[PDB]
Amino acid sequence: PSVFLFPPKPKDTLMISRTPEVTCVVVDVSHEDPQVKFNWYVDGVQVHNAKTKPREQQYNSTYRVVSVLTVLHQNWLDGKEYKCKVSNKALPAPIEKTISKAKGQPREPQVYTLPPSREEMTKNQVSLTCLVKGFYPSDIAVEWESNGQPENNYKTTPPVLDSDGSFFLYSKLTVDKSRWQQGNVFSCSVMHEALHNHYTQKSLSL
Amino acid sequence: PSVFLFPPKPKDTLMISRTPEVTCVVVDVSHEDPQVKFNWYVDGVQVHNAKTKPREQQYNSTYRVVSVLTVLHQNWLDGKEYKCKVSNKALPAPIEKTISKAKGQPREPQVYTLPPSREEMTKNQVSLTCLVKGFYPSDIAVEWESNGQPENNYKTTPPVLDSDGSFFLYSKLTVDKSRWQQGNVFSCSVMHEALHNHYTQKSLSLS
Amino acid sequence: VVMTQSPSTLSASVGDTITITCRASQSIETWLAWYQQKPGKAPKLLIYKASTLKTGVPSRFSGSGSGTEFTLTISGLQFDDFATYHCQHYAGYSATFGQGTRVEIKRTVAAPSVFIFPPSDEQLKSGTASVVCLLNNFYPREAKVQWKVDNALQSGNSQESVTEQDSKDSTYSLSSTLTLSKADYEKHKVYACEVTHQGLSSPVTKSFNRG
Amino acid sequence: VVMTQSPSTLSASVGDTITITCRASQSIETWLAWYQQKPGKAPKLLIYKASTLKTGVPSRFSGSGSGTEFTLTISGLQFDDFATYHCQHYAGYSATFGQGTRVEIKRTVAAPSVFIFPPSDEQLKSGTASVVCLLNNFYPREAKVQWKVDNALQSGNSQESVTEQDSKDSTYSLSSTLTLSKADYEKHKVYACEVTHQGLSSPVTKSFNRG
């Protein structure tokens, strides 16, 4: 067996610092039917071992021979098609799975930050909100900061399809009403393909 | 032969007037043995039927059989469990599926209205936000209204598991910047098990 | 600017008045053109600046709109008009096109009649094996064919071809050819073509056993 | 304006002083250049205006002549100098070359040792049969291979490849591959490679019978 392809994490393809990767996961491989082989194809080419690396199993009573391929930020962003071609004895035929990034003119996201509600100013903690809309495709990375340092207690809703075929989401940072009172400045970081330098940063404070 | 269990919609069990139901769907019932038997259980009881109600259909090259069990708002809200048992002669053993509301104590949702950012009111349309946090279970319903009528250009994010273990989401209503300025007042209605009459409401204006 | 046409396939009868819509993601004033294209031929300009008919184009073609919403109207469809229509925003240096709208002759839904053909031994003697699947007389044009060899789902070893609407019954037909060497062909027994189409309630499989 | 270079092949020893001639069909003043070219590489300019050495070119290269008669002299051949040399008349907007002179290491005449190899089984199972003939360690370079199938001369179904002069013994080797489909191969009995070479007073044939 049972194959599943996975696309790279958005943040990985937007910064050369990190290495993107197409992860091919195969589940429920039998004890008597191991020996799992792989084959990666990028736009047809490469039938013979490319720059792959797969290993590790053991499960509920089955296997799972997960292969991993290093992606070129450009390659992926330009839309090259990645094809994982698994091959197993206990498998009727050679299964397959392909994938490329969502097609379509990319659209730069709008980032707006919102203060906590007056009504929420009655709790020992407040909600810093970050709105992000108008972006396409949906791959996106959102983070928070305070004067150079990272914020941990935040949650981000997944991408949702708006009326115009674009996506939007909201990120929510939970902070002590005091820190918001002291006038500290928080910032919403958004990583996306259509942003200049694949990155924009918006601030909020009392 | 596959079987999928579907729970009633969030509003169905919150409003006594609505009709909440649990639906059992069976796909891929071979053309040869189209016999399908349903058995329903509410906390393990009812091998002997109940409301129940099946129909029969045909598709690609298989059969689809749907059975519908109407439930009692309080049985659902009281966490009762519903079992659908599907027996088919072309099946090694019967397949059973069970569903109910998530286990956990009900937390009241906090609903706040959030006006647009100064930097957005420079566009023809703005965003009126409605924050709903700290609720549980995730079953919930959100809506918008400006005057005695629904606003239909809005979107709600799906619920998100907070650090609390409670749930939170955001609904974004999009209004012509011209309207928001005319002093119009909007409001989002949130329906939840933990709200007074399963319903609260918050207003938002430009004052 | 992104241009979107509606619908993607427009089905109508001869003599009908039909409208194709084109929307721009942002205002483009009236900088919008419409082209007609027949299969294997060059696009032909019909209308430009939203509503100006190119000299020589028949008067049954008309265009309207400005800003973000545009329409091409064909008032009294003739057999010559069943074709693809493309809208285009053209600017000083670049241009952008809609996805195209195929205008086809409407008829009732028809499921494909499916046939599989083994390779001839005459060919097989030469060292190649072509296995052919025919999907005959179906409508609408969208269909899916997959090949299985000894129940193994195949990938990347087939090609497909589709006819234009049949002149008598307005259906489409499709051929898929699975190509293997003689040697690879003789390694396996069961050859099967599996087909889906909206007109079929379940997939249709045709098969033969080698030899 | 035709340029005639002589000789076509020049065989010499390391350290030799050699001359290559170019004759023009009419006077070209001193508008002549000389180029060196190694197999698979680009030509490199040595000399222009008949006698001017390009900077960096070793002083052992020299050129002379004017009118219709031109000479390239290499005074003390080094291993690096074994190569093809080309003369060129160049004008403002056109040029023409001689046919080239291949300068090689001289050694005694050596007859090729000839081997024929059938197609392997592995391949024959796939639908193709390739038959290889080898001409091993011969000198000089010109050798003719003629393929015969049931004593019928083959044409346009073979390709040849020749090595560069062996570093130790100064011979050449040649491989010729004849290519037929399993079908075509299985229609005939005897397969033969027929070799002509300076070292062979009579043509040499190596054969095998199919299977």
A200 shares a domain with A133: yes
Residue B6 lies in a domain: yes
Are residues A15 and A94 both part of a single domain? yes
Q: What is the CA radius of gyration of chain C?
A: 22
Residue C170's contacts (CB-CB under 8 Å, 6 or more residues apart) are: C104, C105, C106, C107, C139
Q: Is residue A157 part of a domain?
A: yes
B205 touches chain A (CB under 8 A): no
Considering the domain architecture, whether residues B11 and B94 belong to the same structural domain is answered as yes
Residues B49 and B8 in one domain: yes
- Solved by what technique? X-ray
* C124: phi then psi, degrees, rounded to nearest 5: -60, -30
Q: Residue B147 sits in which domain range?
A: 110-204
Q: For the domain D113-209, what is the CATH superfamily, name and number? A: Immunoglobulins (2.60.40.10)
Q: What does C118-186 look like in DSSP terms, one character per residue?
A: PPPHHHHHHTEEEEEEEEEEEBSS--EEEEEETTEEP-S-EEEEEPPPPTTT--EEEEEEEEEEHHHHT
| Domain layout of chain C by residue ranges | 3-105, 113-209
Tell me if B182 is assigned to some domain. Answer: yes
What is the C-alpha to C-alpha distance for residues D8 and C80, in angstroms, rounded to an integer? 67
Resolution as reported, in Å: 6.5
Q: For testing the chain B interface, which of C68, C194, C200, C202 should be mutated: the one with the most B CBs within 10 Å?
A: C202
Based on the domain organization, do A136 and A170 belong to the same domain? yes
* One domain for residues A131 and A173: yes
Residues of D in contact with C121 (CB under 8 A): none
D112: cis peptide before it, omega within 30°?
A: no
Does B201 contact A at CB distance below 8 Å? Answer: no
Our CA-based measurement puts residue B123 at a distance from the nearest CA of chain A, in whole angstroms, of: 11
* E strand segments, A9-92: 21-26, 40-42, 67-70, 82-84
| DSSP 8-state code for residue C112 | P
DSSP for chain B, please give it.
-EEEEEPPPTTTTT-TTS--EEEEEEE---SS----EEEEEETTB-TT--S--B--EE-SSSEEEEEEEE--HHHHHTT--EEEEEE-TTSSS-EEEEE-SPSS--BPPEEEEEPPPTTTTTSSEEEEEEEEEEEBSS--EEEEEEESEE--SEEEPPPEE-TTSSEEEEEEEEEEHHHHHTT--EEEEEE-TTSTTS-EEEEE---
**Contact present, A113 and A204 (Cβ < 8 Å):** yes
Q: Is C100 left (phi over 0), alpha (psi -120 to 50) or beta?
A: left
Domain containing residue B173: CATH number: 2.60.40.10
- The total domain count for chain B is 2
Is C113-209 in the same CATH topology as C3-105?
yes
Distance (Å) of CA B80 to CA D18, D115, D185: 106, 88, 78
Same structural domain for residues B137 and B192?
yes
B105 within a domain of the structure (yes/no): no
d(CA C94, CA C31): 12
The bridge status of strand C9-12 relative to strand C101-105 is: parallel
Please indicate, yes or no, if residue B173 is contained in any of the structural domains.
yes
Same domain, B76 and B115: no
The encoded tokens of residue C115 equal 């046939």
In this structure, the answer to whether residues B63 and B136 fall within a common structural domain is no
Answer with the one of A100, A134, A150 that is the final residue of a domain.
A100
Are residues B80 and B31 part of one domain? yes
Contacts of C119 in chain D (CB under 8 A): none
> Comparing C-alpha atoms, which of C8, C31, C11 is closest to residue C86?
C8
A96/C contact by beta carbon, under 8 A: yes
**C-alpha to C-alpha distance for C173 and C162, rounded to whole angstroms:** 6
In this structure, the answer to whether residues A137 and A61 fall within a common structural domain is no
B46 within domain boundaries: yes
Sign, CA torsion C186/C188/C191/C196 = negative
Mutation site for C-interface testing, chosen from A87, A105, A136 by largest number of C Cβ within 10 Å: A105
Residues in chain D within 8 Å Cβ distance of C125: 183
Phi-psi region of C126 (alpha: psi -120 to 50; beta: other; left: phi over 0): alpha
- Report the alpha-carbon distance of residue A170 to residue A142 in Å, rounded: 9
Burial class from Cβ neighbours inside 10 Å (0-12, 13-18, 19+) for residue B27 reads middle
Structural domain contains residue B104? no
Instruction: Kindly state whether B61 is in contact with chain C, defined as any CB-CB distance less than 8 angstroms.
Output: yes
A105 occurs within a structural domain: no
| Fold annotation for C3-105 | Immunoglobulin-like (2.60.40)
Residue B3 one-letter amino acid: V
Establish if A45 touches chain C: CB-CB under 8 angstroms.
Answer: no
Q: Which of A39, A65, A100 is the last residue of a domain?
A: A100
- Verify that A95 and A155 share a domain, yes or no: no
